[PDB]
């Protein structure tokens, strides 16, 4: 998504600079800059203008990290306990 | 401007548009019906907040201003996108 | 080693301590040591008093940057979830 | 004297079944059971139901005793405010039989129970003061009403907008700090009201926000998991040594 997203970004921005140079028309017009400005709801440029989205950035990662911390704790309790149980039952009772 | 810098202070509208404080309401809210900006207004500090945008035409300095702040999104993201490709390619294989 | 602690220990953080109150610990009468403190500390030299302005001091926010490194913490954290896998 | 009333009622428990036919005892005992138990404040509807039972047993008896029977049962509808039996009794053919003067004032008292409406309740309070005197307990009947009807008009004023100034919102109840705001502080304790006050600037803030969902569903399961390992510690030490 970064590759195919930003390669057409560079291919077009070089042809859009070529406009002033040569190949005018296409002017276009106007479709080029119009939806580019719809892309401009967030630029995102220096730096990210996330002052409102900063605390919200980690706040979306809030529960994702919490559950990942909560699941791996009990999944271990399912994995660690049950493995030790069944292991020593076969291991030591055989010899 | 690249903004945001989205919410705007009434004194700035009172500078450019040179309109009095009591008339800024009718001004910016009429643009809400026209459709050039949907941004609601914050009336506690009297600051007019913007949403979306209305593009109009283009200029030679706009393309040069584009390549500055457009490709900057291309060079910043792909640079750290390689960091996502670099470290995490081992856990995928 | 005790004398240089009068500047280090007493603050941070106090508001304002009077002239002769600091002299009670430093003894002497009007030594050049407290005069060297007015230079070294800086801090403040007030009339008949000393001030901690401004303010108390430097007013730590502390920073809005660590939101960055919080995303860095999720990098290796999500990687550890992929190591199990 | 409640214990002496119940002791006289307890002796009537074996007295009703002692003779052959009561002829009316248990029905009267039911009304007496609607007095001490009502003084016990057990259940408002069941005690009111005993008046309905006594009213069914009051048919074809002395009218002055029957004309004063509606004094207790229809004014018992005043205390409850939610008997749900309102339309059953008074709209039946048996309760409409009394056209007398004293019961016509009781018929609108039974309507006064359907009224509530503290604007009207404080008005008719003077007109019904005569029937208020015949109330067996004058304070408790109208105290549980006035205390309940208090928040009835309070949930009207506090509902529309989230936060309200505590001085004007308690000006309709005429005072703030002494009882009301302490009773309103008890509302958070009774869960009937979710919010918090401000003593300095006088603004009551209502917040229902702080849920408990994910947390108790986690730690409480781990406390149970403490019984998984401890009970397995017996298996551990037994097989090894």
UniProtKB/Swiss-Prot annotation, chain A:
It comes from the Eukaryota. The modification N6-acetyllysine is found at residues 9, 19. Component of the 26S proteasome, a multiprotein complex involved in the ATP-dependent degradation of ubiquitinated proteins. This complex plays a key role in the maintenance of protein homeostasis by removing misfolded or damaged proteins, which could impair cellular functions, and by removing proteins whose functions are no longer required. Therefore, the proteasome participates in numerous cellular processes, including cell cycle progression, apoptosis, or DNA damage repair. Belongs to the peptidase M67A family. Does not bind a metal ion. Component of the 19S proteasome regulatory particle complex. The 26S proteasome consists of a 20S core particle (CP) and two 19S regulatory subunits (RP). The regulatory particle is made of a lid composed of 9 subunits including PSMD7, a base containing 6 ATPases and few additional components. Within the complex, PSMD7 interacts with subunit PSMD4 through their respective MPN domain. Interacts with TRIM5. This is 26S proteasome non-ATPase regulatory subunit 7. It comes from Homo sapiens (Human). The gene is PSMD7. The chain holds residues 196 to 290 of 324 of the full protein.
Swiss-Prot record, chain B:
One of its GO terms (molecular function) is structural molecule activity. Keywords: Acetylation, Proteasome. GO terms for biological process: meiosis I; proteasome-mediated ubiquitin-dependent protein catabolic process; ubiquitin-dependent protein catabolic process. The modification N6-acetyllysine is found at residue 15. Transmembrane segments: none annotated. One of its GO terms (cellular component) is ficolin-1-rich granule lumen. It comes from the Eukaryota. Belongs to the proteasome subunit S11 family. Component of the 19S proteasome regulatory particle complex. The 26S proteasome consists of a 20S core particle (CP) and two 19S regulatory subunits (RP). The regulatory particle is made of a lid composed of 9 subunits including PSMD13, a base containing 6 ATPases and few additional components. Component of the 26S proteasome, a multiprotein complex involved in the ATP-dependent degradation of ubiquitinated proteins. This complex plays a key role in the maintenance of protein homeostasis by removing misfolded or damaged proteins, which could impair cellular functions, and by removing proteins whose functions are no longer required. Therefore, the proteasome participates in numerous cellular processes, including cell cycle progression, apoptosis, or DNA damage repair. This is 26S proteasome non-ATPase regulatory subunit 13. The gene is PSMD13.
UniProtKB/Swiss-Prot annotation, chain C:
It comes from the Eukaryota. There is a cross-link at residue 32 (Glycyl lysine isopeptide (Lys-Gly) (interchain with G-Cter in SUMO2)). Belongs to the proteasome subunit S14 family. Component of the 26S proteasome, a multiprotein complex involved in the ATP-dependent degradation of ubiquitinated proteins. This complex plays a key role in the maintenance of protein homeostasis by removing misfolded or damaged proteins, which could impair cellular functions, and by removing proteins whose functions are no longer required. Therefore, the proteasome participates in numerous cellular processes, including cell cycle progression, apoptosis, or DNA damage repair. Component of the 19S proteasome regulatory particle complex. The 26S proteasome consists of a 20S core particle (CP) and two 19S regulatory subunits (RP). The regulatory particle is made of a lid composed of 9 subunits including PSMD8, a base containing 6 ATPases and few additional components. Interacts with DDI2. Interacts with TASOR. This is 26S proteasome non-ATPase regulatory subunit 8. It comes from Homo sapiens (Human). The gene is PSMD8.
UniProtKB/Swiss-Prot annotation, chain D:
Phosphorylated by AMPK. Residues 43-211 form the PCI domain. There is a cross-link at residue 93 (Glycyl lysine isopeptide (Lys-Gly) (interchain with G-Cter in SUMO2)). It is found in: Nucleus; Cytoplasm, Cytosol. Highly expressed in embryonic stem cells (ESCs). Expression decreases as ESCs differentiate. GO terms for biological process: proteasome assembly; proteasome-mediated ubiquitin-dependent protein catabolic process; stem cell differentiation; ubiquitin-dependent protein catabolic process. GO terms for molecular function: structural molecule activity. Induction: By FOXO4; expression in embryonic stem cells (ESCs) is mediated by FOXO4. One of its GO terms (cellular component) is membrane. The keyword Nucleus applies. It comes from the Eukaryota. Keywords: Acetylation, Cytoplasm, Isopeptide bond, Nucleus, Phosphoprotein, Proteasome, Ubl conjugation. Changing residue 91 to A: Does not affect phosphorylation by AMPK. Belongs to the proteasome subunit S9 family. Component of the 26S proteasome, a multiprotein complex involved in the ATP-dependent degradation of ubiquitinated proteins. This complex plays a key role in the maintenance of protein homeostasis by removing misfolded or damaged proteins, which could impair cellular functions, and by removing proteins whose functions are no longer required. Therefore, the proteasome participates in numerous cellular processes, including cell cycle progression, apoptosis, or DNA damage repair. In the complex, PSMD11 is required for proteasome assembly. This is 26S proteasome non-ATPase regulatory subunit 11. It comes from Homo sapiens.
